[PDB]
Ligand binder design. Structure first.
Ligand SMILES: NC[C@@H]1O[C@H](O[C@H]2[C@@H](O)[C@H](O[C@@H]3[C@@H](O)[C@H](N)C[C@H](N)[C@H]3O[C@H]3O[C@H](CO)[C@@H](O)[C@H](O)[C@H]3N)O[C@@H]2CO)[C@H](N)[C@@H](O)[C@@H]1O
Ligand SMILES: NC[C@@H]1O[C@H](O[C@H]2[C@@H](O)[C@H](O[C@@H]3[C@@H](O)[C@H](N)C[C@H](N)[C@H]3O[C@H]3O[C@H](CO)[C@@H](O)[C@H](O)[C@H]3N)O[C@@H]2CO)[C@H](N)[C@@H](O)[C@@H]1O
Ligand SMILES: [Mg+2]
Ligand SMILES: [Mg+2]
Ligand SMILES: [Mg+2]
Ligand SMILES: [Mg+2]
Ligand SMILES: [Mg+2]
Ligand SMILES: [Mg+2]
Ligand SMILES: [Mg+2]
Ligand SMILES: [Mg+2]
Ligand SMILES: [Mg+2]
Ligand SMILES: [Mg+2]
Ligand SMILES: [Mg+2]
Ligand SMILES: [Mg+2]
Ligand SMILES: [Mg+2]
Ligand SMILES: [Mg+2]
Ligand SMILES: [Mg+2]
Ligand SMILES: [Mg+2]
Ligand SMILES: [Mg+2]
Ligand SMILES: [Mg+2]
Ligand SMILES: [Mg+2]
Ligand SMILES: [Mg+2]
Ligand SMILES: [Mg+2]
Ligand SMILES: [Mg+2]
Ligand SMILES: [Mg+2]
Ligand SMILES: [Mg+2]
Ligand SMILES: [Mg+2]
Ligand SMILES: [Mg+2]
Ligand SMILES: [Mg+2]
Ligand SMILES: [Mg+2]
Ligand SMILES: [Mg+2]
Ligand SMILES: [Mg+2]
Ligand SMILES: [Mg+2]
Ligand SMILES: [Mg+2]
Ligand SMILES: [Mg+2]
Ligand SMILES: [Mg+2]
Ligand SMILES: [Mg+2]
Ligand SMILES: [Mg+2]
Ligand SMILES: [Mg+2]
Ligand SMILES: [Mg+2]
Ligand SMILES: [Mg+2]
Ligand SMILES: [Mg+2]
Ligand SMILES: [Mg+2]
Ligand SMILES: [Mg+2]
Ligand SMILES: [Mg+2]
Ligand SMILES: [Mg+2]
Ligand SMILES: [Mg+2]
Ligand SMILES: [Mg+2]
Ligand SMILES: [Mg+2]
Ligand SMILES: [Mg+2]
Lengths: 144, 260, 67, 185, 62
RNA sequence: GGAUAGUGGCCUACCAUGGUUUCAACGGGUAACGGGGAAUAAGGGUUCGAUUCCGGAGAGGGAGCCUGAGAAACGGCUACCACAUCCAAGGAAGGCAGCAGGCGCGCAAAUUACCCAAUCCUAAUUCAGGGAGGUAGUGACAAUAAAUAACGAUACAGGGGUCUUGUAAUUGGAAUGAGUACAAUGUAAAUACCUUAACGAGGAACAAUUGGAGGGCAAGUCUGGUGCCAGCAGCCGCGGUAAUUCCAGCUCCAAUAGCGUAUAUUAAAGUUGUUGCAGUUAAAAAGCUCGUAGUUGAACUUUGGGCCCGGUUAACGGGGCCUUUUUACUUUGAAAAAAUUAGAGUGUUCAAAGCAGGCGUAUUGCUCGAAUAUAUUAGCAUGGAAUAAUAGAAUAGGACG
């Protein structure tokens, strides 16, 4: 029983068979395949600067109804086009076409969050100030 | 890496210098000596860090360049000069002398010997061979080569050595129950006598030891230095006389003489 | 307070063994005048470019009429 | 390539942050000691845990073990010397029972209140951090100063300030000088 | 999902709510002195009971 | 044989056909310099290490070389390729992964400062030189310490005549550094720290913040705004007219000179399972049998008896007698860098640290320190002979004198 070798000489059959089944673990897979460095819009980094293409309102999922006010962004280091959500209230007015905004994840391990389908990123800064200091009125966005 | 390395980094220095972590990135890097800079005392360490006579780097030179210090009978100009085991270090204007001998923790101890006993030194004969013309020769731990020696002397003896001249005043052979100072190792700095020498063909003979308090322990033959006849060294050992008192035993003796 | 002090066996022996930055604030010596390290450094780099007295050189300058 | 100057963090923060009860017990300890932030409660429970864990793996060693001898008795002797472990509770078993209020009790703040000199823990601190509670000759303004057992009797007001010695404060010495032109010329 | 909706109303609720000023009020103690007031109001005082030890009720029921 | 400083297919000549591999060669990837170490803190582990120390490699890419004890050197030369500077058009010069500093890159990182005083190195050498190094600027990386108030008075509520807290914004004198600054102190010279004249406290200033208040999860059935809109919401969910959830006011919780967010990683995770998973039906026993590798494989060979010597709190431990007398493993040790981890000691005012210090007669002084233990693989020496392997006389080519 136990289905696995306990023999005193069996170290390699053990050491291997685990190294084999570790591949079933999602977190381990991603590390070996280099998933982030390849398949991710960010390089595997925590943030990306990009530039806004078009302001995008997005319908929500069930059972919710509202327009979510996102943007299309083209990452500078990358060129990969990505859609990011603009949070709080009426901050879409703070970003415009071709505004050069800084992005971050949603904290979801790459998944999309909440009633917003297919948006994995959020705006952090605009023009290099912040979403707070604008929405909280503390600072103000400069001119181009 | 392209040649000789002219620097030493602090934290890379020998531990038995007892340098402090901060105060610089570098140690003195002892000069090319009679002794291996691994196990050796640069003059600056002795004068400045032990005798506390010199406060500076520039100050140690002002002493030597004032012609003050000698070592093993001869004046030593070199700041980093590597005074090793069984050395002399006479300072006339201070009237003192010091024979370098190890602690029971294993560091070079600051040990004053009188205007005599700084006459002679002991050294361990590392090899004895035939030189040119047939002339036999012998050389000590510190690289003294002495010519036309006693046919009894073999490797792993010691030799009593006059300084102002040289040569050989008697000697001590290596056999059961001789006095021995431990040159380096886990047991470095200890003193004892020979319980047995475990022979090993092709390197690393074990030497069994017993001290004045009847403790047993072993080290390498290469680190076994004969210091004389059992219970009677040929030089003056410091306090504890290399007895290796246990850490527990230490605490008492510190809180013993500590009171009123 | 805590500090250090030295009692010398001559004044001429403190005229010798003593670090010279004290000898100014002690009055026994004079603060030396030198341009800042780089200005001191640069002039040395300028001069090694000339191999000689530098005398025949600056004349050959005026041999061809200045620079 | 400077020698690598070392350091450490003095506290360990709790796993489950929001526990409804523990929050209260800490708040009390903040008041019934007179502590600034919850970190000064954390600092001690971390100290205690390493103290405990030290004794934890020490009692695992069958007795007459030099490690249980030399080290275990080097703890007690330090632990009593500050007044935490009572003059004799001394054992490796009685440090494991030693709780968090015992260290906190020995703080210079929680002493300066204890015998005279303060009559508040908030007056205590304010006194400590401002100059004069000094122990012996040296002023020590640290509210955490950790009074040792026999250092106790040497703690009184400091050789300076209105409480222990020369001159009064310049709050009042300014009051006496503003009647100098009022009641004088 | 369906990616083109109205952008017309954004900052709507926020900008149609009336501004309310924050009252000028006594500055609260900092440091240990704030942690002093918390000691009392939770116990040594016993503002509220029924075993709830209510920290912040709407001004009770009656 | 030649070549080297020298061994060696290092190269050449002749000769043979060898050498490695499922115990994983060879090949590919590495967002790979190796190590000391770091994060995590039942145990067993998982993850990381460009980076203070050691070793290695390189100086745009390659190769070649001169000098030399030492270089296949680059702040040396020669060539090529790729850059790139001056030019009078003939020519000439260059290598910041040294210190600064510029452009570029991006989420991502500081002054074209001072100095040889310290640590040290170099030289013909106490003197000179050192962007090694040190100082200072920038510096919320990280770590330590831990101000933002303290005590009465009076006026009402309240606990056995009267304390002792709760509340007034009605007063009362107290205190202190944050600043500010003679000085001296520090220092190479300043800078700041420490010590200190004169100055420095009434709420408005010497005004703490960041997140959150349905559950998880600690704190609003309060008011106003909005009306499945604007928005919140890690997840469950909130909002479609009386919103515990959005925007705010009020209050309240939480941690607090710091709190939040993104990303990675660890714990939780016995959801990688050696410890320690699960597999009839939730994910999952090959259709069936053979079988190489691999892993695994019954028992039996000195058992028992009798005395002795010296050990440590009759239980037990160690060393010898008598009775017909090759490994794997396990202990002890040696040889193990310093940092780092653990840890002894010590009043840096506490502490993080540091490895100093401590007593004195303080008028030519005494003096204890700088302990201790650690990755358990390999190697070396050693005691142990259970366990599991291995050899031994079968056509005797056996042992013995
Ligand atoms: N500015 C830093 C660097 O300077 C370099 O330029 C320098 C080099 O081209 C050349 O430097 C030579 C060097 O080639 C040679 N192999 C060594 C020599 N010592 C250097 O010489 C230099 O230093 C001496 C003082 O020693 C000074 O007279 C002068 O600054 C210069 N001739 O002289 C230039 C300075 O005058 C390059 N432009 C570049 O790598 C970088 O800009
Ligand atoms: N720091 C001093 C010591 O250095 C040691 O360094 C190691 C190596 O330097 C040394 O390696 C060997 C040595 O085994 C042997 N008996 C002598 C030999 N010359 C050394 O090797 C030397 O030459 C080789 C080949 O050129 C180089 O690759 C190597 O870097 C160099 N050290 O052996 C040491 C132990 O393996 C250790 N790090 C340590 O004991 C200690 O730190
Ligand atoms: Mg859903
Ligand atoms: Mg999309
Ligand atoms: Mg900008
Ligand atoms: Mg931006
Ligand atoms: Mg940015
Ligand atoms: Mg040197
Ligand atoms: Mg070596
Ligand atoms: Mg040959
Ligand atoms: Mg050869
Ligand atoms: Mg072939
Ligand atoms: Mg690489
Ligand atoms: Mg790595
Ligand atoms: Mg590395
Ligand atoms: Mg851990
Ligand atoms: Mg663990
Ligand atoms: Mg676990
Ligand atoms: Mg890299
Ligand atoms: Mg890396
Ligand atoms: Mg290196
Ligand atoms: Mg380059
Ligand atoms: Mg020559
Ligand atoms: Mg090189
Ligand atoms: Mg070079
Ligand atoms: Mg080169
Ligand atoms: Mg260069
Ligand atoms: Mg021309
Ligand atoms: Mg640079
Ligand atoms: Mg940029
Ligand atoms: Mg940064
Ligand atoms: Mg960084
Ligand atoms: Mg210097
Ligand atoms: Mg100099
Ligand atoms: Mg001269
Ligand atoms: Mg920071
Ligand atoms: Mg303030
Ligand atoms: Mg100050
Ligand atoms: Mg909120
Ligand atoms: Mg709750
Ligand atoms: Mg409402
Ligand atoms: Mg909520
Ligand atoms: Mg609200
Ligand atoms: Mg696990
Ligand atoms: Mg096991
Ligand atoms: Mg499972
Ligand atoms: Mg199934
Ligand atoms: Mg199949
Ligand atoms: Mg430590
Ligand atoms: Mg068996």
């Amino acid at each position: 029983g136990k289905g696995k070798p306990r023999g005193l000489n069996s170290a390699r059959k053990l050491r291997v068979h685990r190294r084999n089944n570790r591949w079933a673990e999602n977190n381990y897979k991603k590390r070996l395949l280099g998933t982030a460095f390849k398949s991710s819009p960010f390089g595997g980094s925590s943030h990306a600067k990009g530039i806004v293409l078009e302001k995008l309102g997005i319908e929500s999922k069930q059972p919710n109804s509202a327009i979510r006010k996102c943007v299309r962004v083209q990452l500078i280091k990358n060129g990969k086009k990505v859609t990011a959500f603009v949070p709080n209230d009426g901050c879409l007015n703070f970003v415009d076409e071709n505004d050069e905004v800084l992005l971050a994840g949603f904290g979801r391990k790459g998944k999309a969050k909440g009633d917003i389908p297919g948006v994995r990123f959020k705006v952090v800064k605009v023009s290099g100030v912040s979403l707070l200091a604008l929405w909280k009125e503390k600072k103000e966005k400069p001119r181009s | 890496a392209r040649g000789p390395k002219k620097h030493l980094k602090r934290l890379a220095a020998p531990h038995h210098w007892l340098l402090d972590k901060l105060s610089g990135c570098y140690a003195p890097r002892p000069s090319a000596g009679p002794h291996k800079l691994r196990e050796s005392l640069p003059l600056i360490v002795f004068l400045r860090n032990r005798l506390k006579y010199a406060l500076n780097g520039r100050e140690v030179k002002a002493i030597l360049m004032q012609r003050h210090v000698k070592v093993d009978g001869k004046v030593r100009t070199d700041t980093t000069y590597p005074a090793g085991f069984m050395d002399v270090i006479t300072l006339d204007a201070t009237n003192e002398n010091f024979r370098l001998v190890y602690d029971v923790k294993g560091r070079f101890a600051v040990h004053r010997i009188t205007d005599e006993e700084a006459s002679y030194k002991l050294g361990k004969v590392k090899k004895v061979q035939l030189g040119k013309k047939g002339v036999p020769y012998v050389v000590t731990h510190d690289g003294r080569t002495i010519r036309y020696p006693d046919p009894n002397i073999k490797v792993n003896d010691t030799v009593k050595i006059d300084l102002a001249s040289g040569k050989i005043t008697d000697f001590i052979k290596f056999d059961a129950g001789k006095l021995v100072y431990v040159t380096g190792g886990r047991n470095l700095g200890r003193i004892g006598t020979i319980v047995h020498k475990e022979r090993h063909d092709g390197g690393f003979d074990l030497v069994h030891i017993k001290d004045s308090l009847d403790n047993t322990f072993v080290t390498r033959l290469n680190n076994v230095f004969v210091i004389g006849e059992q219970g009677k060294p040929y030089i003056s050992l410091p306090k504890g006389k290399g007895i290796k008192l246990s850490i527990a035993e230490e605490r008492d003796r510190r809180r013993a003489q500590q009171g009123l | 307070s805590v500090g250090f002090g030295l009692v010398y066996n001559s004044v001429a022996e403190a005229k010798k063994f003593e670090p010279t930055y004290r000898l100014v604030r002690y009055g026994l010596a004079e603060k030396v005048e030198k341009a800042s390290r780089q200005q001191r450094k640069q002039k040395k780099n300028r001069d090694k470019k000339i191999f000689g007295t530098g005398k025949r050189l600056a004349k050959k300058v005026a041999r061809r009429n200045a620079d | 390539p400077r020698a690598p100057r070392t350091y450490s963090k003095t506290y360990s923060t709790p796993k489950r942050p929001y526990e409804s009860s523990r929050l209260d017990a800490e708040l009390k300890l903040a008041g019934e000691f007179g502590l600034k932030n919850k970190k000064e409660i954390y600092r001690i429970s971390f100290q205690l845990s390493k103290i405990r864990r030290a004794a934890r793996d020490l009692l695992t060693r069958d007795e007459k073990d030099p490690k249980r001898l030399f080290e275990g008795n080097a703890l007690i002797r330090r632990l009593v010397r500050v007044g935490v472990l009572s003059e004799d509770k001394k054992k490796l078993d009685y440090v494991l029972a030693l709780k968090v209020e015992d260290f906190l009790e020995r703080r210079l703040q929680t002493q300066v209140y204890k015998l005279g000199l303060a009559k508040s823990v908030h007056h205590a601190r304010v006194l400590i951090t401002q100059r004069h509670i000094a122990v012996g000759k040296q002023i020590v303004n640290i509210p955490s100063f950790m009074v040792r057992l026999d250092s106790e009797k040497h703690i009184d007001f400091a050789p300076t300030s209105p409480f222990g010695g020369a001159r009064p404060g310049r709050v009042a010495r300014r009051n006496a000088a503003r009647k100098a032109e009022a009641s004088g010329e | 999902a369906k990616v083109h909706g109205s952008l017309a109303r954004a900052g709507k609720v926020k900008s149609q709510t009336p501004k309310v000023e924050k009252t000028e009020k006594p500055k609260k103690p900092k440091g240990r002195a704030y942690k002093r007031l918390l000691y009392t109001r939770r116990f040594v005082n016993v503002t509220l009971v029924n075993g709830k030890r209510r920290m912040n009720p709407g001004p009770s029921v009656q």
